Amino acid sequence: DYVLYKDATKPVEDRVADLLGRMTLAEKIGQMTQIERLVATPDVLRDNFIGSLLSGGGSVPRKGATAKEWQDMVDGFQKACMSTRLGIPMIYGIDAVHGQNNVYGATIFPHNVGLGATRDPYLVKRIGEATALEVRATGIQYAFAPCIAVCRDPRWGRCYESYSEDRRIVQSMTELIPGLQGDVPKDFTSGMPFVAGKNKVAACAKHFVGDGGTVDGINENNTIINREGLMNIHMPAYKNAMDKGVSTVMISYSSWNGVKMHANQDLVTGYLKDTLKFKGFVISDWEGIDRITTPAGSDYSYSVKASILAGLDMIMVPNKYQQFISILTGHVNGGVIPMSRIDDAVTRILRVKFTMGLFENPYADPAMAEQLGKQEHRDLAREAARKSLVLLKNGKTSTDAPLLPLPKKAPKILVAGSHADNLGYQCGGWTIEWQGDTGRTTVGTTILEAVKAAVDPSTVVVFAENPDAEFVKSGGFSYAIVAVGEHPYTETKGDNLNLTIPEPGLSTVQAVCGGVRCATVLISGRPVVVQPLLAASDALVAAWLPGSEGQGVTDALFGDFGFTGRLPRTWFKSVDQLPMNVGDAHYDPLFRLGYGLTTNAT
Numbered sequence: 001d002y003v004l005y006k007d008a009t010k011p012v013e014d015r016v017a018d019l020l021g022r023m024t025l026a027e028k029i030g031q032m033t034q035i036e037r038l039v040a041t042p043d044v045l046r047d048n049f050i051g052s053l054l055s056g057g058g059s060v061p062r063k064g065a066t067a068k069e070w071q072d073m074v075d076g077f078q079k080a081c082m083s084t085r086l087g088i089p090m091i092y093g094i095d096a097v098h099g100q101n102n103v104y105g106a107t108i109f110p111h112n113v114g115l116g117a118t119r120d121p122y123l124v125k126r127i128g129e130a131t132a133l134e135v136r137a138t139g140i141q142y143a144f145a146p147c148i149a150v151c152r153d154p155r156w157g158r159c160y161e162s163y164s165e166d167r168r169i170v171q172s173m174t175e176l177i178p179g180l181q182g183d184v185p186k187d188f189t190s191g192m193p194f195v196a197g198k199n200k201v202a203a204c205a206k207h208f209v210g211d212g213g214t215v216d217g218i219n220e221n222n223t224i225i226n227r228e229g230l231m232n233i234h235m236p237a238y239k240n241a242m243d244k245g246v247s248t249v250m251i252s253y254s255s256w257n258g259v260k261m262h263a264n265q266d267l268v269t270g271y272l273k274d275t276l277k278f279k280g281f282v283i284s285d286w287e288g289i290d291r292i293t294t295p296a297g298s299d300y301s302y303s304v305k306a307s308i309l310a311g312l313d314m315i316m317v318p319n320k321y322q323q324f325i326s327i328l329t330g331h332v333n334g335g336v337i338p339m340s341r342i343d344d345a346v347t348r349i350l351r352v353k354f355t356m357g358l359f360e361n362p363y364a365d366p367a368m369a370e371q372l373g374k375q376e377h378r379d380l381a382r383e384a385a386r387k388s389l390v391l392l393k394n395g396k397t398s399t400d401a402p403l404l405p406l407p408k409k410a411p412k413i414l415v416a417g418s419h420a421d422n423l424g425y426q427c428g429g430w431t432i433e434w435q436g437d438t439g440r441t442t443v444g445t446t447i448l449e450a451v452k453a454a455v456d457p458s459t460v461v462v463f464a465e466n467p468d469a470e471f472v473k474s475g476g477f478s479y480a481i482v483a484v485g486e487h488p489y490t491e492t493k494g495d496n497l498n499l500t501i502p503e504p505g506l507s508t509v510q511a512v513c514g515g516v517r518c519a520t521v522l523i524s525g526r527p528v529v530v531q532p533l534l535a536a537s538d539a540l541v542a543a544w545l546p547g548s549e550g551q552g553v554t555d556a557l558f559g560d561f562g563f564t565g566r567l568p569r570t571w572f573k574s575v576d577q578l579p580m581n582v583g584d585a586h587y588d589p590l591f592r593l594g595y596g597l598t599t600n601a602t
């Protein structure tokens with residue numbers, strides 16, 4: 001007879017209820033299990049009734065794989081799943097955090113902090129639209145974005161993934177969600193999940209609660225703040241996300257006053273689910289539950305109990321799914337965790353799946369393959385890179401002739417610096433590799449290429465990564481552009497207490513600037529010790545981690561557009577000043593939040 005859940009014309013709650021009613025326990029726990037493509041097999045997926053798969057950073061089919069290779073891999077796995085007794089399609093997730101970043105040729109947008117500098121939530125929405133198209137070009141339906149942490153200490157390895165230290169700004173940027181998922185209906189009820197269909201992806205409001213508030217900005221550490229601070233600083237954005245229909249919510253590795261978020265039922269079930277009435281699914285972070293214990297995974301049985309009772313719906317295992325499934329099966333058999341908990345979890349996961357239309361379109365559209373790196377997206381990244389720049393100084397003394405914007409026609413110029421021609425540096429973490437990488441890792445334009453693409457043909461362009469002072473003084477150059485900065489980093493690799501840029505960086509700037517007037521382009525993921533760099537330069541621009549399209553940078557240096565970005569964070573005088581955010585008592589910044597010089601297009 002008739003199977004209501006397979007009927008695409010039925011209400012999503014009816015289909016969910018129908019399916020749920022036919023699921024054995026193995027099938028239920030299988031849905032709540034997310035595993036890494038690296039441990040996946042058509043059998044594993046089929047036998048274990050696996051409910052979701054993910055690519056961790058750098059987890060790809062082959063280096064330089066095309067978009068159909070991605071689609072082919074995704075479809076392959078999908079086929080195993082569609083071949084279960086219930087044929088419940090799996091959902092494939094990936095960190096498409098500044099474009100479809102793990103994918104070769106994907107358009108790499110400016111990282112978040114640089115996006116905060118734009119104060120343009122519409123442009124952020126447009127990036128989210130572009131991003132969804134580029135993710136769907138590879139056959140993926142779920143992006144682990146946006147990271148709406150409110151970084152309160154830039155020593156935190158992930159501060160670049162936070163739009164601003166000011167939640168008002170982060171709240172404004174949640175426009176990334178309808179960008180990726182498409183806008184919610186007028187009929188829409190906050191907390192309800194939504195995805196417009198196949199050319200859109202399920203989004204994810206990440207690191208549920210207080211990740212950007214850790215002590216000393218130590219990653220995955222503890223957030224010591226009262227409940228009024230939590231809700232006034234770290235909660236706000238999550239509610240906007242609910243009114244925006246964010247599909248999923250990922251839980252943070254961090255602790256709130258000593259309690260792990262992965263084991264916190266008050267905030268996950270009582271608050272996020274009961275109070276905010278979120279109806280999508282709550283997913284753990286990579287080994288998020290193993291981590292509730294110290295040592296991590298020291299009592300995995302406890303991990304499972306703790307996180308499932310707390311409220312998490314889907315578990316990003318991502319490797320030892322055997323152990324996870326065995327254990328959870330055991331806790332239910334022993335009544336330790338009740339079927340209602342399980343059913344609620346599976347209820348949330350199917351709702352998202354049914355809603356986004358996964359049951360109607362579980363495979364990739366070969367037609368979307370050309371979306372990856374589409375030139376129009378690239379033109380958009382270029383826009384956002386340019387808009388995210390913050391001119392910090394444009395002249396050594398109030399009476400100097402402002403250096404920017406530079407003339408395009410000059411007899412000869414120098415482009416110098418470790419970051420002048422390094423695509424991987426320019427893009428930062430979460431790019432091709434998990435930690436990012438160095439060199440020409442993908443398709444794009446470095447500050448050198450962009451400079452050559454900009455200047456008058458009569459303009460001779462000289463590149464020297466690290467020129468000595470005499471080299472510059474004898475070069476008869478009209479001016480120089482020096483690019484220096486941080487190296488790519490992700491997560492704990494980024495936790496940094498000294499916040500000074502690696503050398504040669506200052507020495508090259510001083511070398512070049514001592515000999516010729518220079519515009520310093522600082523590529524960083526955060527505020528870094530800058531008074532020395534400021535001391536040597538005629539003009540200095542904070543480019544943040546601008547992405548693959550370097551022309552956005554020279555679109556401003558050369559006057560094609562004027563500078564408009566403004567600090568999305570406080571620029572500190574020193575690290576012993578930290579934390580120190582707007583509204584503080586010892587507020588004594590080198591540059592206050594909102595700071596930024598302007599110029600006019602030529």
Ligand SMILES: *[C@@H]1O[C@H](CO)[C@@H](O[C@@H]2O[C@H](CO)[C@@H](O[C@@H]3O[C@H](CO[C@H]4O[C@H](CO)[C@@H](O[C@H]5O[C@H](CO)[C@@H](O)[C@H](O)[C@H]5NC(C)=O)[C@H](O)[C@@H]4O)[C@@H](O)[C@H](O)[C@@H]3O)[C@H](O)[C@H]2NC(C)=O)[C@H](O[C@@H]2O[C@@H](C)[C@@H](O)[C@@H](O)[C@@H]2O)[C@H]1NC(C)=O
Nearest residue numbers: 437438487488489493494495496497498499500502503504
């Ligand atoms: C401010 O505090 C930081 C702590 O995080 C510290 O930076 C970290 O320092 C540690 C060493 O103590 C370093 O770990 C080592 O990594 C070695 C490889 O280093 C390379 O790998 C990282 C990862 O790929 C690349 O950035 C680059 O480094 C050099 C110099 O500029 C450059 O010429 C290279 O071409 C560039 N190479 C690449 C591929 O990008 C990293 O910095 C170097 O490549 C490894 O073999 C060792 O076993 C060890 O584990 C961390 O990588 C580093 N973290 C980051 C995010 O950079 C700061 O240290 C200062 O800078 C470092 C770059 C060193 O030069 C060190 O001597 C400096 O003291 C610290 N600052 C101060 C003033 O204390």
Ligand SMILES: *[C@@H]1O[C@H](CO)[C@@H](O)[C@H](O)[C@H]1NC(C)=O
Nearest residue numbers: 218220221222223254255258
């Ligand atoms: C935070 O960091 C210190 C290591 O710096 C560790 O010993 C401590 O237990 C961590 N706290 C949490 C909640 O992770």
